Design a protein around this ligand. Sequence first.
Ligand SMILES: [Mg+2]
Ligand SMILES: [Zn+2]
Ligand SMILES: [Zn+2]
Ligand SMILES: [Zn+2]
Lengths: 196, 114, 133, 43, 264, 180, 773, 160, 65, 49
Amino acid sequence: ASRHGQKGTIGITYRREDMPFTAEGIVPDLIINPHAIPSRMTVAHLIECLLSKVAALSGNEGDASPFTDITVEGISKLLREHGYQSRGFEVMYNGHTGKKLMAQIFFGPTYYQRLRHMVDDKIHARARGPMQVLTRQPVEGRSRDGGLRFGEMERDCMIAHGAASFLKERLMEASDAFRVHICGICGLMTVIAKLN
Amino acid sequence: MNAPDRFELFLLGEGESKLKIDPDTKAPNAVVITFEKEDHTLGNLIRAELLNDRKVLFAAYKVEHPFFARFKLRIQTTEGYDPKDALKNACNSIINKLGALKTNFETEWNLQTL
Amino acid sequence: SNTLFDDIFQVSEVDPGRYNKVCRIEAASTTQDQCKLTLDINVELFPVAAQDSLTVTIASSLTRSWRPPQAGDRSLADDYDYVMYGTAYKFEEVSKDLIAVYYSFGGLLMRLEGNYRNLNNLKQENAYLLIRR
Amino acid sequence: TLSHLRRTNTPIAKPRQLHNTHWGLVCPAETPEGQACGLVKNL
Amino acid sequence: SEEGPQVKIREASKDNVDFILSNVDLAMANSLRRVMIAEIPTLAIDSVEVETNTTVLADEFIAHRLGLIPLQSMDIEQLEYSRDCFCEDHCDKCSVVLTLQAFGESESTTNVYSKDLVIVSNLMGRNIGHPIIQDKEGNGVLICKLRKGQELKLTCVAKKGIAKEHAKWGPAAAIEFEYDPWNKLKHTDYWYEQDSAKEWPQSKNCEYEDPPNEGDPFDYKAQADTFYMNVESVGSIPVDQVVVRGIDTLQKKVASILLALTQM
Amino acid sequence: FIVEDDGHKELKVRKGHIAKLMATEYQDVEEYTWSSLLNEGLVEYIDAEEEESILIAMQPEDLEPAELDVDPAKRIRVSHHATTFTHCEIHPSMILGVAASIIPFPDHNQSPRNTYQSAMGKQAMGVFLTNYNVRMDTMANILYYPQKPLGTTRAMEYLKFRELPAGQNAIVAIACYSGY
Amino acid sequence: RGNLMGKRVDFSARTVISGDPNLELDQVGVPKSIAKTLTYPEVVTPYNIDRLTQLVRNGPNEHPGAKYVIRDSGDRIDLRYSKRAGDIQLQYGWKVERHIMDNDPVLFNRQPSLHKMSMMAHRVKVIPYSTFRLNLSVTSPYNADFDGDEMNLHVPQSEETRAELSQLCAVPLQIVSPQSNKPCMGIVQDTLCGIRKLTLRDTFIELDQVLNMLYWVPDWDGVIPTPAIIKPKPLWSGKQILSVAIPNGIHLQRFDEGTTLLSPKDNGMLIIDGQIIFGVVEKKTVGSSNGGLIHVVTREKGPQVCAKLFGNIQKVVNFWLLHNGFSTGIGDTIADGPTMREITETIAEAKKKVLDVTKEAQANLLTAKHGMTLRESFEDNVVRFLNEARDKAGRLAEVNLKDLNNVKQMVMAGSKGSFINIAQMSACVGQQSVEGKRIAFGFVDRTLPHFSKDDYSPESKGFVENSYLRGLTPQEFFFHAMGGREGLIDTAVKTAETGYIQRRLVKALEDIMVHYDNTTRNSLGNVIQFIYGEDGMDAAHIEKQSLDTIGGSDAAFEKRYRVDLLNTDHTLDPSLLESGSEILGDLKLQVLLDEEYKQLVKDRKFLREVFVDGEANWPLPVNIRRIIQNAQQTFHIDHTKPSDLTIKDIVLGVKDLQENLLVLRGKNEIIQNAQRDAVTLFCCLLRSRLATRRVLQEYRLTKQAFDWVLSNIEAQFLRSVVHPGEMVGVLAAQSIGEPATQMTLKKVTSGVPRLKEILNVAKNMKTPSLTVY
Amino acid sequence: YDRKVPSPTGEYVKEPEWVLETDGVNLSEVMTVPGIDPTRIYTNSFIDIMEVLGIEAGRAALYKEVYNVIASDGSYVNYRHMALLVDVMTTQGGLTSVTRHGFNRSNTGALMRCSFEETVEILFEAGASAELDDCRGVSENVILGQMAPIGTGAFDVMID
Amino acid sequence: MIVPVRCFSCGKVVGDKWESYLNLLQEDELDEGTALSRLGLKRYCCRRMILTHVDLIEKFLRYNP
Amino acid sequence: FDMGGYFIINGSEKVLIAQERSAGNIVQVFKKAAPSPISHVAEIRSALE
RNA sequence: AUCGAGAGG
Ligand SMILES: [Mg+2]
Ligand SMILES: [Zn+2]
Ligand SMILES: [Zn+2]
Ligand SMILES: [Zn+2]
C-alpha cells in the first residue's frame, strides 16, 4: 500500500521485458490501475509521485509536509526544468510489441509499504481432519488443520438456491453425522444398543 | 509455495514438444501451431514476418495465460501453399535479416574508436 | 451486382464534433433540388473541405472472408479515391415522393434523401459506397 | 511502537465523534476502524 | 554494406553503444531488445555454502548479493549448463568455484568487496569467472562490512543462466529505445492542457529526422523502419557482444523452430 | 507560543531566541533548552478548559499589519479578521499523531484515507529496532533494503523515520495493462 | 446457532483472491496446493478405472492424484504411506478419493452472505499460484475487491450434490437476479473503460491488430469481416471488431437524450443481428443495466452464451486496451487559469450572499417562513448558498475538462468517478456536516479557539472552499476530519444494524415456499399469498415494458389503434394488406375491429385506474418488442410488399393467444377466475401491442411471422412462471437486506433507522407526519 | 406538490397543487375536517392506518413505507419480495413484528422458534405445554440433519 | 541495511558507488544531485537507490560481538 | 532508538493504555426526557484528592 | 479449553 489508503495485492508479476518501458529504458517496479484514483480522491498520492520524481532527478528531498506553500505548479515547473513533462506524464512503449502506447503514462517514484498480510500465511484446505471432543465437529483454526464455518447466512443462501441435498451434506456428512438408536415407545435416545 | 520453477519458462517438460500442429476447424487451408516454452519475443516476430507473405491470408498469435510460457499461432494461406512452408520461409527470412544486421553492426563497431 | 445510385454533390457543411480523424459532412446534390446527403467521413484519409464537388456511388459488389488484394492481379471496381462498406438499417418514408436511406459503415453514418431510386438500395447488408475526387 | 505508546481508551453522549476540543490534543485521523472507532485514540 | 537492416553507430564506449537501426520491421527490433534483456547467457553465482558467518547480515542476504555480483562472461559459450553436463553436482566444464574469506583484524571497520573473491576451480584458459571491477579505486562491489572479530568464510559456485530464470544473469542494464520522434505515424495521441508542442519536451533524436510539413496530409501508409537505441552493459559482457549475441540468440531460437519443423 | 503587546502585538519569541536554540542544537556555552523558553515566559502550557478563554493565531505572520497580485495555485487562506491574540500555534501540523505524521500531503486527501493509512502504517515492515538480531521475539519482519522516503514531512525528523524507514521508493506507473 | 443452524465443515478452503482476465466467468482458479488437499469420492466404474488407476499411481504428493482408496470392506487405504500404493489393483464398486480437478463443480463464497449470489458454483481450474482467481464480472455479486479479501470454497461429495451445484447454483444461472429483476453482473473496470475508448468513431484498427483481436475471440468463425474502409487503406472500426463477440440474432435498441437515427453524438445503441450500427458502448449498454446486452443475451441465447459473451468481450477489449494504454495523473485535476479564476470568484460571490443574508438576520429584517425558526431559515439559506456554490464551481470545472481528461474518460465510460469527485478534487470540496448540520460550537460560542465567539461565517462553521488540488487549511482539515469521522461511525454502526435486520427478515420468512397449487404458504399450511407476486412469475423472467394504451392524447390513441373500414380516410391502406380494397366497407369485419377498439378503451380506462400517475413502463414477464424484432429477421420481412394477414387472423389469433395463457390449471370457476385475474395486466399489454393497425402498419408482419410470435409469446410466458419449491421467503428477505447493507449517508426519518421502526412496528416514531390533500 | 393528471385532451400533464404536511398525526379527526380530500389522506404512521382504515390499508401503507425506504437510496427491489414481507407482517389480522415478540410467538414448531431468540425459554414452555412439532419447518430438518422440504426436497422420487 | 548491488528497476550495478558518493559529498563539498550525476547515475530509477538508502549496517556494527 | 515507556513482565514488553474518564468534582446540568416528572438535574460526582 | 487483546476484509 502507498501512504494514502491505497491498499492492494499482487495480481501477477511480470519480468522486465514484458513490462512497458519509457524511452530512457526505465521500467515500472509497480503498476496500479487508474480506476482506483477518482472514487477515493487521494490527490496527495499523485503529488507525492510528482515531487518524488523531481527529488530523485535533482537529488533533493521532497517537503510533502502539510500546510505549506508547495503548490502543484512549482513542482511541475521544476520537473519541466528537468526535461520531463510538467505533469509527470511520460511516453511509454509496450513491452510485448515495442510500439508506443496511445496514452501516456503517469510514471514516477512513489513510497510503497509492504504489509503483514501475505498469502502463504492464509492458505488453508481441510478435507477431513481433527475433530472437537464435545461436539464431534471440526476444530477451529488454520493453525489447527481446522474447518471453515458454514454459518446461518450460508445456510440461508443454500435454502434460497433450493439445494436441499447440498445443505444436508454440509450439515451431516461433512461435519457431525451420527447414528443413534431410539425406542419406539419412550421415543428417547435410551436403547442399549449391544450391537454385535 | 505454489510458484512454478522458473526454468519451466524455457525448458521443455516431459513429453512436451516445441511445436504442436492442429488443422483448424471451419477455415480451409488453415492451421494452429502451439509453441511451447516461448513468449512474445518469437511470436510477434514470426507473425510480423508472416504478414509480409503475399500468399498468407491470415496470421495471428496469442498467449492464453501469462502464467504459462507458450502461445498459439494461427496461419491461413493461399491454396496450393502449405502453411508450414510459409512458416519456414518466414523463419529463413528472419535469420537472413538477423545475419545481415550482425554483419553490418560488426562492421560499424570495427569502424569505431572507444 | 452493379451500381444502385450515382450523383455529384456540393459539400456545404463540415463538422468535426469532438473527433480528430472524422468529420460529418453535409452536401447538397448537384443536378438535383430534392436530394441531400449526410455522411461521416474519415478526413484524415480523405480530407474534404467545404464547397468541394464529389462523385458519390452506392454499389453492390466488386459473405466470404476478406482477402488482401494479392500482389496486384486483383482488379478493383473503383477509380475512386475513398471507398467504404456498410449496412442499411432504416428505410424512412419522409413524405409522399420522399424516401431516405440510412447506412452504417462500421458506425460511420449515411443519410440519403431523394425520391427516384426504387429498384435499388434494398434491405441488404451489401453496400459499397465509393467517392471520387 | 510510538503509536502504541501514545494510545487512549474510553470505556463504553456522542463519544466517537471528533469533538472540537480535541484540537491539538488528540489526532484527528489516527483511530481504529470497526467498533473501536473514536473510543480508542492516539495523542 | 549488406542488403537488409542497416546500423549507424552514433557513439560507443565500453559500457554504452548508441546507434541507429534502419530498414528493420519493428517486431524484430523489439525482439532483439527483449533478447538483450532476457535470453543471452551469463555467469553468475547460483550456489553459496557458508562455513562461518559472524557478520550482522544473514546468510541468505549475502547469498542474494553474491548472486547479483557481475562476473566475467566473455568465453561463456565455452561453458556448459549444469543441467546439461554429466557431472554429479558441478564440474569444471559447467561451473566456476569462487572462495571468499574475510576477517575483522583491524580496529576500524573492515569492508568486504568483490576484489576479495578468489577463483579456486581450474579455468582451463578461458576468460571466465573474474569479477567485473569498474571501481576507480580498484575494489569491487561492497559485499559486507566487518567489525573487529567478525569473519565470513564461504564458497560460491557460479553457473550458466539467463535473465528469464533470474535477473542476476542479465548482461544489460537499460536499453534506450525510440522511434518516430516527431510522431509522424501518430502512434500516440499526446495529452495537453494548452499546446502539445510546448508541454511535451523535444527528443534528442528529433534532429536526426526532418520535421513534417504542416501543409502535408497524413501519411496513412507509413511504417516504423528507423529506430534509435542505446545499449548499456553491466560489464560482464562487452556492449558490442551484448547486441551481437542478442542477434545470434534470436536467430538461434528461430533455427530451433525450423529444426522442430524438420523433425515433424 | 505567547502573544503580548510590544508597536503592536507580537510573539514573545524572537529570532535571537531561535538563534540560541539552534546554537544549542549545533553543539550536537550554556545550552538554551525548551525549559528555558518555558521559564522565560516565551511558551505556555494550555489545556482544553483554558483554551476556551484564549484566541490562538495560526502563523506568526498573522500578527503582521495590512495595506491582489496573488498566486492562483495556492490555497485560499482567509484574512483572519481577528485581533486581540493571546497565543500562536507552534505549527498546525502538530495537531497530528505519530501515524498521520508519516502521510505526505494529507491536506490533499479526504480524511478517511488518512485514517486508513494511519491504520496501515503500523503494518508496514521495516527495521523496528537496530538490535533486532539480539532480541528473541515471537515474530519479527525486516526489510532487506529499507529506503527513506523521497516525500518527507518535517515531523519525520522527530519520529526517526528516515533512520528507521518502513517502505521503499518504488517506480510506480498508473496504467491499464493486461487487466491484472 | 453455533452447532446446528451452522457448523464447521470438512472439504473447505479459504484464500486471498485476485483477478484474472483470462478466466471464464464460471471458472475459479484453484491453487495447486489446495487441489492436492480437497478430494472427491469417485466410484470406480468401467468409464473411469483407466483414469482412476493412473490418478492413484500419481498419488497424493502430485496432481492430478488421489489421497485415499475405500474398499467394499469399508476399510481405508492411506495412499500417503501405504506400502501397497504401487500395486493397487482397482476393483469395481470401490471408491477413489481422487484429487480435485479441472471442471469440477465447487461452491465459491464470500462473506457476508447477503445473497444467494454470494454463494455460487464454479468450474475448477487448477492454477499454479497461491491465490483464488476469478473473473472480474463476478466481483459485483460477491462485492469482492482484490485488496486483501479472502474467499471460501466447498467441495460436494455426491453426484446429487454436484448436480445441485451445477444445475441450480451455477454462475450462469445467476446472471439475471430476482432481486431488481435485472442482471447482477456486467462489464467493469479496464474492460468497461476500454470498450468505450474502442467504440468511438475515431477508433480505427489496422490489419495486424484486427487479425490478432479476431483470433483472440475463442468462438471465432474465421471469416475476416470486410473493413468499413477499403480504398485509401483497409481500416476497421472498433465497433466492427467488437461485434464479432456479439452472437448473431441479437437486437438492441435504445435512445438517449438527443439520439436521432443519425446519432450525431453517437448516443444510444443500435445492434442489428449481433452487429452494432451506432452507439458508443458504455455502462448503459454493457453494465448490469435493465435491458442491456447481458439481459437481452441471457434471455435470448441462454445463460451459457452470455457467460461466454463476458469472456469474449473481456478478451477483445483487454487486448485492445493493453496495446492502446490508459493512465491518470494530477494533470487530469487541473482546470484552466480562467476556470479557476471564475471558480474562486463564484465562491467569493456566494460568501458575499451569505454575508448579506447574515447582516439581514442581524437587523431582524428576516421573514421566517411558517413552521421553522428564524435561525432555521437562516441556516437553510446559508447551507443552500454554499451547496450551490460548490456545485456551480464543480460544473465550471467539469465543463473545462477536455475529452482527453482521463477522469472524464472514466466518468463517461461509467467505470469509475462522478460529478462530486471532479468538483471536490479540482474546484471546491464543499461544506462539511456533522449530525446533519454545519459544524457546531464545540467550544463556548465558537468552533475552534482560533475564531472569535459568535462567528457564523462559512469558514468558521465548516466550509472548505479549497480543492484537494489546492490544499486544505488547518481549520478546513480539522472540519473535514470531523465529518469523515462521522462517516466512519455511520459505516461501522450501519453494518451491525443491517446484519441484525437481515437475520430477523430471514428468520421471519425462511419457511415461505411456492407449493404445487401455485399458492405461497409456510410450515403450517397457512396461506401467505394465493399467487406469488399476485401474478405467479419468477422475478428473473420479468422486464420493464411500456403499456402503450396508458399515455398520449385520446387523439393519438385513436390515430394509433382505430380501424374504420366504414370511412375512406380512416381505413387500412390497401398496400398494408393483400385483402386491401376487398375489405373496405365490410360490415361484418367491422364488428370485430369495434370490439377490439372497445376492449382497448376499456384497457386504457382500467390501467389509468390502477396506475394513477399514468406511468406506462412496468415490469412484465414476456418482452414483445424483442420478439417482434426477431420476427422481422427470422422471416426477412420487407416493407414494400403487402402482408397476407386476414383481419380475422390477427384479431381471433390474439384472442386465442389470450385464452392459451396459463398460470394455474384447474377446471373450476374460482381457479379459472384467479387465472383470469393473474393474466389481466399481461393481456392488457398483449392487446396494446397486438392490434390490427399496429401489426399491419407499425411492423408489417406476415401470417407466418404472426403465428411464430404467438407461439413464442406462449412459450416464454409458460417459461416465466414460478417453480414450485422455490423458497421465495429467503429470497425476499435477502433481496431486501442486501440493498439495506449498502444504505449510507429534509426532516424525515429514513434509511436504516426508519426501516428498523417499520420492522419492529415501533409505536413512537421519530417523525410522524400527515400528508393532507 | 407537482401532480400528473389527465388533461381534457387526454395527455398527462403537470397540475401543481397545495398539499399540507403536518408534524404530528391524529388521522381519525383530521380526515373529518371539511375542505380536504379524505380519499387521499396518508400517514407514515401505518399503525394508525391499520386502526382507522382496516388491515388492507395498513398492508398498502406498509408497502409504501418500505418502498420509499428502498427508493431513498436510488435502489430498486421487485414488488414481490416486499409484498411477501408485508403480507407476512399482515396476514394475521393485525401488525406482527419481525421480532422476539412477533413472528417468533406463533403456531410454528418449537424447534424453529428456538433457533432465533429467547432460545431456551421457548423449549421450556414447549415442554410444559407438551408441544408437538410437525418438523415441516426448514429449521427442524436442519437441526435433525435431514433433507428439508426445499426445492429439491419438496417432492419424492420413486421407481416406475 | 547495506548498499544494494543493483538498481531494482534496470539493474545497473550501484554497490561499487557508495563510498565514492560519500566521499564526493563530504570530501569534495558537493551536493547530492551533482554527485549522483558524476557517478554515472542519470536515470532516477538508478538515483533513488543511492540517494534514498539508509546504511543501517554502521549501526549493527556497533554491537559488541 | 528505543524510547522506553514500557514494562518487562515475564519477559514480555507491556504497555499501559491511557484510560479516559470523566473528571470528578464538576457540576453538570442535564435535562430529562419528556416522560419524566422532573425537568432538570444538577449532578456532581465528588472525587477526592 | 477458558478468558482477553489486537488485526483483516
Ligand atoms: Mg473489499
Ligand atoms: Zn422406551
Ligand atoms: Zn559439469
Ligand atoms: Zn536503474
